[PDB]
Amino acid sequence: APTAKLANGDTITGLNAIINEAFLGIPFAEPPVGNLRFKDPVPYSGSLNGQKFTSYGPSCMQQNPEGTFEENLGKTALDLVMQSKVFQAVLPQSEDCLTINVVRPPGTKAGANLPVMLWIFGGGFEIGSPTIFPPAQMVTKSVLMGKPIIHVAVNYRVASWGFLAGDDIKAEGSGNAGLKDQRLGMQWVADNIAGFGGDPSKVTIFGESAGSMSVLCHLIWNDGDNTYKGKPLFRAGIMQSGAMVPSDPVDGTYGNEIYDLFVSSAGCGSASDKLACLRSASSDTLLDATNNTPGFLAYSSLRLSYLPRPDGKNITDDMYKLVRDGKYASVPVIIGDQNDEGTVFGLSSLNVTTNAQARAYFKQSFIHASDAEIDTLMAAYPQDITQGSPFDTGIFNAITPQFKRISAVLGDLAFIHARRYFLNHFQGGTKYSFLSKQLSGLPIMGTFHANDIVWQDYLLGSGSVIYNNAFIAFATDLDPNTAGLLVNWPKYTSSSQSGNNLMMINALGLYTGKDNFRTAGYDALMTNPSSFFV
């Protein structure tokens, strides 16, 4: 019964879920299969008139997080689970996965002109899909606050299929395919969303983790040109854990190293035209090859095999440099973090137990860093177990003498101080920042990376007034304060400003604070960001 009219005039039918109306599995691009593998997506051209969209399509192919070229039980066990029929029955995957999803308040009709919140899932640029991030909580809340919004989730290619790099990809101009899928989805929204009751001039893009870093990539995309048909694609962005990607270009050292290993595992090591050889390999061969390169939970940890990289075309340069140079879209922004971002990633190196070992690991991970730089970093992030993450836990959580130390560095470099760097240089619009400590006390993990997904999509907690209410107010009014919070959210200007510039969250509620913690670490990492690029 719920129906919507697309830009071409097609009339589609959806699912009435009582609490909302969903249109799930709408294709937005041609299947990037066979000879279209690794290439920019192609707009869908067929007709959908008369078709019904009542269920989530399959996720793009997924890389085993324990994947690696070494043989280990974690990799194997994980393969057994993902490849099992029950798992494949619950969470199906396919290379034919470029679909978009629209969920709206009950009774919405075209012409409602409601703000749109476009969700970009995260998953290490290696796993994930819109299916595991239910929008009901966000949609119900916007109705209750009398500020209804339309939730749009776009699917995009992950791992090798969406982020293969190296000299061949570069030469062909096929870099950052997965970000191009997201960019096409945004154009699909600009063209079609009105028919669903949405206002295309009121789009706020938001994502968590790799999805958050994706949001930043969209601000600096095409050197800050976010227009399509002369109009902005989005008017605001929200970043939940992640800003700049600390990465070398598509044709750099590790981009080629991973590419060579992928090609060899694919059995294309002898082809003179390896891309052509990859494009005709079976789906299982490419899957096995991908799982033979390191996954995000493997020892390599955040030194990712697949991630966005400057390609000289769409991401014209070092992302830190682009933000420093003013090459971004001029939109207001909300960016925040979870107190203990690094704890899950610190679990990947529990065999690093001595200071010498920790030094070697950092050396191995940051190939452009000098001894002197590695020295300043290890001085700024001491072995002292009270200093590490989970933060403020004293002598607790010391699985090994380096765990808390390694966790602190990874979380700061990848998420926390990267956020500070962004806020100190971004002058494109009003900035608001938050820091959550909602789970202080949770053994080992603390206020871990991605716990915000639980409070935003699954359960109500103290953080939910931020993750739902505050975000919906921002999408609607460009000010999180219209949410009617008990604590005013102060604008952020710089980390060295006078008073409180951070909205904080604890188990009891909100309070404000300052973004002035671990400044030695910030200087050790952000003085010359590129020294720590992967």
Ligand X SMILES: CCCCC/C=C\C/C=C\CCCCCCCC(=O)O[C@H]1CC[C@@]2(C)C(=CC[C@H]3[C@@H]4CC[C@H]([C@H](C)CCCC(C)C)[C@@]4(C)CC[C@@H]32)C1
Ligand Y SMILES: *[C@@H]1O[C@H](CO)[C@@H](O[C@@H]2O[C@H](CO)[C@@H](O)[C@H](O)[C@H]2NC(C)=O)[C@H](O)[C@H]1NC(C)=O
Ligand Z SMILES: *[C@@H]1O[C@H](CO)[C@@H](O)[C@H](O)[C@H]1NC(C)=O
β partners of residue 89: none
Q: Which one of the spans 128-136, 161-169, 176-184, 277-285 is the region binding ligand X (CB under 6 A)? A: 128-136
- In whole angstroms, what is the distance from residue 198 CA to residue 190 CA? 10
- Taking the complex as a whole, the smallest distance from the CB of residue 173 to ligand Z amounts, in Å, to 8
For residue 84, give both structure tokens: 């099992």
Sheet hosting strand 198-208, strand order edge to edge: 15-16, 21-27, 99-104, 150-154, 114-120, 198-208, 236-240, 333-338, 431-436, 502-505, 510-513
User: Does the protein bind ligand X through residue 302 (CB under 6 A)?
Assistant: yes
Q: Are 305 and 165 in contact (CB under 8 A)?
A: no
**Binding partner of residue 70 among ligand X, ligand Z, ligand Y, none, CB cut-off 5 to 8 Å per kind:** ligand Y
Choosing from 104, 183, 417, 419, the residue that interacts with ligand Z (CB under 6 A) is: 183
Which ranges of 227-365 would DSSP assign to H, the alpha helix?
Answer: 253-266, 274-279, 283-290, 319-324, 355-365
Number of H helices, E strands in the chain: 19, 15
Q: What is the smallest separation between the CB atom of 283 and ligand Z, expressed in angstroms?
A: 26
Task: Show which residues are catalytic.
Answer: 209, 341, 449
Residue 235 in 3-state DSSP?
coil
Task: Choose the one of ligand X, ligand Y, ligand Z, none that binds residue 19, judging by a C-beta under 5 to 8 angstroms depending on kind.
Answer: none
Q: Which helix (H) or strand (E) holds 406?
A: helix 403-411
> What is the separation of C-alpha 196 from the centre of its chain, rounded to a whole number of angstroms?
26
243 binds ligand X (CB under 6 A): no
Q: Binding pattern to ligand X, positions 257-296, x when CB under 6 A?
A: ---------------------------------------x
Q: Give whole-number Cα distances, 478 to 60, 138, 235, 348, 357, in Å.
A: 33, 17, 9, 39, 47
Rule CB under 6 A: say whether 307 interacts with ligand X. Answer: yes
User: What sign results for the dihedral spanned by CA atoms 464, 217, 307, 503?
Assistant: negative
Is residue 76 within the footprint of ligand Y (CB under 6 A)? no
Residues 305 to 334 in contact with ligand Z, rule: CB under 6 A: 313-314
Q: What sign does the CA torsion over 359, 365, 368, 373 have?
A: negative
Could you say which of 22, 24, 127, 250 contacts ligand X (CB under 6 A)? 127
Interatomic CA distance for residues 377 and 355, integer angstroms: 12
Beta carbon of residue 210, minimum distance to ligand X (angstroms, whole number): 4
Residue 129 or 501 having the CB closest to ligand X: 129
Give, in order, the Cα–Cα distances in Å from 435 to each of 142, 256, 291, 511: 23, 36, 34, 10
Does residue 142 interact with ligand Z by CB under 6 A?
no
Report if residue 70 touches ligand Y, rule: CB under 6 A. Answer: yes
Among 185, 207, 246, 428, binds ligand X (CB under 6 A): 246
Q: Of all residues in this chain, which one has the CB nearest to ligand Z in the complex?
A: 314
Site pattern 338..357 for ligand Y (x: CB under 6 A): -------------xx----x
**Of the residues 151, 180, 303, 449, which one makes contact with ligand Z according to CB under 6 A:** 180
- Please name the residue that has the structure tokens 């691009």: 29
Picked from ligand Z, ligand Y, ligand X, none, the partner binding residue 180 (CB below 5 to 8 A depending on kind) is: ligand Z
- 402 makes contact with ligand Z (CB under 6 A): no
The answer to whether 154 touches 192, Cβ cutoff 8 Å, is no
313 binds, among ligand X, ligand Z, ligand Y, none (CB under 5 to 8 A by kind): ligand Z
- What 8-state DSSP symbol labels residue 41? P
Q: Which residues bind ligand Y (CB under 6 A)?
A: 70, 299-300, 351-352, 357
Q: Which residues bind ligand Z (CB under 6 A)?
A: 180, 183, 222, 313-314
